[PDB]
């Protein structure tokens, strides 16, 4: 996969390609040709892996540096890293151990873009409830397996990527939708995947709506009262650079 382009940003998500850092030079050129200024670059990099789940940190940092002629660098959460060139909402889920009755629908002997076949898939799995008819959607079912969907609604997007290999099945969800309480959104995605474990990462800057709520003690939809079939573990909040905050919650299905 997915590329989203907005007035001030580009988001690229893929599964199984070569390094996305290859795209940085041409994205920077696209910025300079419209006389914008690069402010943030972030990329996923796995330093630490768990059993249910590339270049070294040094190699990726050196590559990214090579694509620029100053900035600050560091982690966001432990799996994403930023460059900030000093002079909105984002919620993400990662899901492991997907429902086996659902994952069969994301196997196929043919590559199928949006059409009657993916309509059957979306209806049968409940993706149609996550991406309802208020969204403009397009999707792709891969051979032998895998699935991607993008959806847009005004300034909002949602996207899901599914890699259902039995050994280490995985799905991700991301959205910039603004809600005061994300429990309905998150639980709607869990309805589709019913995963053995999942994490949610939410950005909570104090000057954003959800962050203003969080920083004042408000309930934002990640809390344990919404996930009775799961046990919470190791909530982590970081002010990952001055003024900017990230929250990660982790849930594991009750055996």
């Amino acid at each position: 996969x997915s590329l989203f382009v907005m007035k001030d940003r580009v988001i690229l998500i893929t599964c199984g390609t070569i390094t996305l850092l290859n795209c940085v030079p041409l994205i920077c050129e696209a910025v300079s040709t419209v006389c914008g200024e690069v402010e943030w670059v972030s990329f996923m990099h796995k330093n630490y892996s768990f059993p249910w789940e590339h270049l070294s940190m040094a190699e990726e940092f050196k590559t990214l540096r090579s694509h620029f002629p100053p900035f600050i660098f560091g982690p966001i959460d432990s799996d994403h890293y930023f460059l900030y060139f000093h002079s909105d909402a984002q919620l993400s889920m990662t899901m492991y151990g997907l429902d086996r009755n659902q994952t069969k629908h994301w196997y196929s002997d043919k590559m199928l873009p949006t059409g009657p076949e993916t309509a059957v898939i979306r209806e049968a799995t409940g993706l149609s409830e996550v991406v309802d008819d208020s969204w403009i959607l397009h999707d792709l079912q891969y051979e032998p397996c895998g699935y991607s969907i993008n959806a847009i609604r005004g300034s909002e997007y949602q996207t899901i990527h599914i890699t259902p290999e039995e050994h280490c099945s995985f799905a991700s969800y991301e959205t910039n939708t603004c809600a005061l309480n994300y429990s309905k959104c998150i639980c709607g995605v869990l309805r589709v995947f019913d995963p053995e474990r999942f994490s949610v990462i939410v950005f909570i800057d104090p000057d954003s709506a959800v962050g203003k709520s969080y920083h004042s003690g408000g309930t934002i939809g990640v809390e344990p009262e919404y996930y009775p079939n799961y046990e919470a573990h190791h909530r982590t909040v970081n002010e990952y650079t001055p003024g900017h905050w990230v929250l990660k919650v982790n849930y594991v299905k009750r055996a």
Binding site: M6, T14, V34
Partner: peptide, 28 residues
């Protein structure tokens, strides 16, 4: 091919004095 692991890249630009009115949407 389409298989794990997932990768993600995001680039955000500042709109400044002198930026095209449409930003990155000026491109086809």
């Amino acid at each position: 091919s389409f298989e794990g692991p997932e990768k993600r890249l995001e680039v955000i630009m500042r709109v400044v004095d002198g930026t095209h009115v449409s930003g990155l949407l000026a491109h086809d």
